[PDB]
Write a protein that binds this ligand. Structure first.
Ligand code: NI
Ligand code: NI
Ligand code: NI
Lengths: 99, 114, 571, 99, 571, 114
């Protein structure tokens, strides 16, 4: 596999995304790390599916609303940054206020 | 076109060290266990079990590609081409039978009793 | 005897005339020469040439020539005289010789400065590629983990500045003042890479710059955030003359003090390193690339722009707001970025790399740049420029050596020449330090097998340590014996000025790392840079930001799918 | 749990196998780390189920074909090694060219 | 602009394509390459390129590159890749670079290693020839004045042994025992040449040889007068293996212990230096040339036999009686010489030098050899072999470079390789010591203008010191500033073993001279010797002493008039 | 054939630095004493007595062979071709008039006082 440190650390973020959508299935208001976890995975999966930077930014904003998270989580997240591997290479994904 | 990490090889065979004498010798494994001798091993300082013209292998290795070795099974007799060592032809180690010097000798195959 | 090249390639690797495909790219590299007499090939293994009285010898290590380590026949990719198949020798952490290995007493044509003995430990050089390690001239010392990601892609040398994640460091490569310099020279003791600290080059007096030179800085840094004035450069250059060091510039993008032509007058034709010559990272907008036409300049480039992609325009409009803390609501902050996001210069940058104008390649790590994608993004651009511009008149009729040799020079020998460390590191030459990288041609430019530093493996690909082999999964990169104990400090070099070395920085600052002084920074020019000696005429339109080189519009269409990325990486 | 380092590192390889199987469900050509992840997990699961070294080697070769992976992934994988805990102990699992 | 080569040659000297006649010989040497961009030629003089802000520069000497001395445009004659026109740089008594000189700030294409500044003092390189100084491996230390005569012909390095005019020293190059070695290493403090002391190699024990190695000997000497037995040789080589030094042999001409084939068996294929491979000086009579066919051997030759003259036969019978105190009345003493005066091997020796078999050239000073006619007798043989054997298949169709480059290698690079001092001296290469000689092509190989040693002129042609110029008569050679005070010791090197250097002979023996340890004497062979890598088959008739090389009789008719002798010398 | 120590030069003239602009200027010696200017002397930083277009010699030396100098007698007017300096084109010394580099201006002969 020859997993570089950038690839190894991108697994602990996916481990949290399965716990975030499992808690979403039971009907729970997501916290700060859980909300950012399911927001960042859509950018990595979007880049894997071959979606453009414009599409993944707008798609990452339409994942969760204010009723889907706890009271005050939207106030402390005015921006969400993450790097994903696109067809052309590694590109930044800035989501200005997804809730 | 060629696959990832492939080699678009040129249609030409490789030529090994030419202009060096060759000596064919019949080697028979007398022992009940198998023996495998590598490319650069000195055949004069090999096991005593192998029955062959020992005197004709003075400072002479196998005439095969480097690295690779040819296996001998118990009893099986195989013909093997031999090539002399390069440079100064000064060998050391193996079984303390000669440990240095060269035989060579223009016209007589003399010196080094054993 | 005679045998086919198919069975020879499967054991001893390629030779003269054989072409090697570099991963999934359209580039093929042909061997220009084989420095070995066919028949006596030296390889290690069970019952092979390297044994007692065959490849080894009874003579002592003191007999100058007995190697500490040998790479058994590998395809070298050097910018001086690369693309050759030869046995490389290591001794005292330096490259002893390049040619044929073994015992000269029993093998014909053995090179004198290359003999295997009792002191040598062989490396499987066959079916692999050897090269000099990469250098990064734009490194913001924001995090020490940055080095592990850099070293995980073939970059064993750093050059820049910083304290840690301070906004000051997040935007500028500076370690300002003797106190900060000493603390950073001492923190670098626990790093597995060579380092070259850059001081703040923003002063009217001669004194504040002298304090940093004697403290241990390889050069100076002139940023737009700290004021890229004509006086800040004049005084940084005046001091760089008498100190024999290199100044790096990030010119005023606001055109406040003057225009690009006024800063070239302030340089006074004195050698200088220009970061992000394209303009995304910084510099006098719009015509920054205009600076790459003069000979004194040493043009480098950040790697988020290279290769020029279809979605590159969107990401950099949000990225520019964090690096230099620009607000998205203030009109002067966002209208200032509208010019800096010009897409015509990014496409020009990519073709200027092919033409041989942009002489080197940097990153600007964690501040509009990626440290672990350097060698990759060099080879990604090489694939795009071959597929669009085709083979050059200088390039051979059947191989892409000229382009690869020109592109590897941008990360290996040219940044070393720029920062005055050519004699130490840069190319796979005799007498230089053993800072080498090994990769399979299948994983070339992205994932190396080993990383040799000073003759010892610092970082490498490793499986389960409890397993019966080093290949079983999970195979993730970990620090090796060359990055453990006192050997990490021995094998790594803390670069400084001669002033600092003469003063005794190693003793005063107490550095157990190797301390080599930088030199030949000032007399060098663009002609001294390998494979990138062009100084072409330039014409830039200021309204639409169109770039014309020698009366010809320099541009190229963006690409959607680049070479080696989702096919090898995961995240 | 007293997880030895050999057991801790065998979790990051399982985290990737769930992402490989999830991307396979959507119909995506697996890359180098994803292909090796889903190849190695069948050996660890095979050893857990009590399957012999002969069975898991041949079963690991019949998981994916050339059409199930990206163009060139089969060329760079002539062998796949991994150690799994069998009923008799830890044993090596070498899969010579699974595609 | 354009100008003819006649006016260019009269000021700046020759260039690519120009052929230079070497004195009154039939040899012409053509320039293979010119490492300079035409237009900016650097020369010193009244109102010329080398002035303030033109060739010089305001930067400091510590900016590694500012030369201490520069040779303005000279024709180099090196054996590696000689016959080139280029500016040679000198810094710290070593060669800093070979190419183009001047200021890179105002001149295009200036080599980075070569820059003229405030520290450089120019030399008129134009219309002159540069070369590496000569080395003499057979030097009987009979008189210290011997060096002045040697240095007066371009020989700035000595190798041999002796106390003074003792019969022991008169016949053998030995400084036997630690006491004699220390006294000679200390007497050499007042000598203007490099020295390599050789100990006595006649012992059955290890100990007596170890005592000399640690005292400070560069090698051993095995003479027929001290007993050239198989044990004396086999035990001297055994010590030369573990010490990394070179053994010189003068085999038993009496065939007492055995024949030449029995001494080659005693060598055990271990590298060895053979003096007078022809046989006049000594060695197993008659077939002593037979030893040159093996690869381990390093064949050298005495110079009274070369060139082969008509009257050479007569002088040898009277000369052989004094060197090895042989009586003219005793039958065993005179009948022994009748075989050693064989004229067939002297003519073979001359052709073997042309073929490239006899790899080097020595003298055997004041004991069947002349020290002040070495470079001369090399060029005298070159004229005879061209006039008889004609141009070689390897030699070019319009120049005699190959023969001159092959012949200069015998006195410059090959003796340095043999005695393990290649890295120090031997060729005009970068990083090597500045032991160079300058001569006019009119007076080439006989009378040089200057002799640079360690970057300073040691000996040179000088007129009346009271006169208004250095050219007025009487012009006789005198010691210069490089041979005065403490600078003589600084610029000269006392060569020793590593074992001696490690023990601290410089401190124990108190040597103000430079002390460098010899190395790479054992692993080297015939192929490592430059332009003389041939190992042909040999067949020698023992009755009439006829020599056949590869089934072809090797001989040549003698010459009555040789090149450069009466026309230049007086006595 | 050629005499001892002679040079058999090839029948071809030497070509001095091409692809560099040339500027012809009339120089007249006003002073009563002779002046001789060498090949690499910066023509803009010369004696004030010599009357010529001073502004045109921005970082430009004489377009003649290196080392050689051309003499000017009192009163005599001579046309001289000028060539720009190589490398970084940064000059120092002479008369403290500029002490720097002559910028290859972006199309106009502008910048710095005179
Ligand atoms: Ni920056
Ligand atoms: Ni003698
Ligand atoms: Ni002698």
């Amino acid at each position: 596999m020859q997993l570089t440190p950038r690839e190894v650390e991108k697994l602990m973020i996916y481990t949290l995304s399965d716990v975030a959508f499992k808690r979403k299935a039971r009907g729970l208001k997501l916290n700060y790390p859980e909300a950012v976890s399911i927001i960042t995975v859509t950018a990595m999966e979007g880049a894997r599916d071959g979606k453009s930077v414009e599409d993944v930014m707008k798609e990452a904003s339409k994942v969760l609303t204010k009723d889907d998270v706890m009271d005050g989580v939207a106030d402390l997240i005015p921006n969400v940054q993450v790097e994903a591997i696109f067809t052309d290479g590694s590109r930044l994904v800035t989501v200005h206020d997804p809730i | 076109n060629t696959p990832l990490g492939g080699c678009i090889l040129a249609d030409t065979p490789i030529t090994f060290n030419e202009n060096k004498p060759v000596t064919k010798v019949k080697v028979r494994n007398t022992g009940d266990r198998p023996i495998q001798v590598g490319s650069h091993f000195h055949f004069f300082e090999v096991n005593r079990a192998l029955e062959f013209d020992r005197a004709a292998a003075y400072g002479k290795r196998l005439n095969i590609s480097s690295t690779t070795a040819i296996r001998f099974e118990p009893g099986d007799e195989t013909e093997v081409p031999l090539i002399p060592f390069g440079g100064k032809q000064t060998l050391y180690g193996f079984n303390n039978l000669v440990d240095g010097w060269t035989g060579e000798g223009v016209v007589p195959n003399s010196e080094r009793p054993d | 005897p005679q045998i086919s090249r198919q069975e020879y390639a499967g054991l001893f690797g390629p030779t003269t005339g054989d072409k090697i495909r570099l991963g999934d790219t359209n580039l093929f590299i042909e061997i220009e020469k084989d420095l070995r007499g066919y028949g006596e090939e030296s390889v290690y293994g069970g019952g092979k040439s390297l044994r007692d009285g065959m490849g080894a010898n009874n003579h002592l290590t003191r007999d100058n020539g007995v190697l500490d380590l040998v790479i058994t026949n590998v395809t070298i990719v050097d910018a001086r005289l690369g693309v050759i198949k030869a046995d490389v020798g290591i001794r005292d952490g330096k490259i002893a010789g390049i040619g044929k290995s073994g015992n000269p007493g029993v093998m014909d044509g053995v090179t004198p400065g290359l003999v295997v003995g009792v002191s040598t430990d062989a490396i499987s050089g066959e079916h692999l590629i050897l090269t000099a390690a990469g250098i990064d001239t734009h490194i913001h010392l924001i995090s020490p983990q940055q080095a592990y990601h850099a070293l995980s892609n073939g970059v064993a040398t750093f050059f820049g500045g910083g304290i840690g994640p301070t906004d000051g460091t997040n935007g500028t490569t500076v370690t300002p003042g003797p106190w900060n310099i000493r603390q950073m020279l001492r923190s670098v003791e626990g790093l597995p890479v060579n380092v070259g600290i850059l001081g703040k080059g923003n002063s009217y007096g001669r004194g504040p710059l002298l304090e940093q030179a004697i403290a241990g800085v390889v050069g100076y840094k002139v940023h737009e955030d700290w004021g890229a004035t004509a006086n800040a450069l004049r005084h940084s250059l005046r001091m760089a003359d008498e100190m024999d060091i290199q100044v790096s510039v990030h010119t005023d993008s606001l055109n406040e003090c003057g225009y690009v032509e006024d800063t070239i007058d302030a340089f006074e034709g004195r050698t200088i390193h220009t970061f992000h010559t394209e303009g995304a990272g910084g510099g006098h907008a719009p015509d920054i690339i205009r600076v790459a036409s003069q000979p004194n300049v040493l043009p480098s480039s950040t790697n988020p722009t290279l290769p020029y992609g279809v979605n590159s325009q969107a990401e950099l409009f949000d990225m520019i707001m964090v690096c230099h803390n620009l607000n998205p609501n203030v009109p002067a902050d966002v209208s200032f970025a509208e010019s800096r996001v010009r897409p015509e210069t990014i496409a020009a940058e990519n073709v200027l790399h092919d033409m041989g104008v942009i002489s080197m390649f940097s990153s600007d790590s964690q501040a509009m740049g990626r440290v672990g994608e350097n060698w990759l993004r060099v080879m990604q651009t090489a694939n795009a420029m071959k597929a669009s511009r085709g083979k050059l008149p200088e390039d051979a009729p059947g191989n892409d050596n000229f382009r690869v040799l020109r592109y590897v020079a941008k990360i290996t020998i040219n940044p070393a020449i720029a920062q005055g460390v050519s004699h130490v590191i840069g190319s796979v030459e005799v007498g230089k330090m053993a800072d080498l990288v090994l990769w399979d041609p299948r994983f070339f430019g992205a994932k190396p097998k080993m990383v040799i530093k000073g003759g010892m493996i610092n970082w490498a690909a490793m499986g389960d340590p409890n397993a019966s082999l080093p290949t079983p999964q999970p195979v993730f990169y970990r620090p090796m014996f060359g990055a453990m104990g006192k050997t990490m400090q021995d094998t790594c070099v803390t670069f400084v000025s001669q002033a600092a070395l003469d003063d005794g920085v190693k003793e005063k600052a107490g550095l157990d790392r190797q301390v080599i002084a930088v030199k030949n920074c000032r007399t060098i020019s663009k002609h001294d840079l390998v494979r990138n000696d062009q100084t072409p005429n330039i014409e830039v339109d200021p309204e639409t930001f169109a770039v014309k080189v020698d009366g010809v519009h320099a541009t190229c269409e963006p690409i959607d799918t680049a070479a080696m990325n989702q096919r090898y990486f995961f995240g």
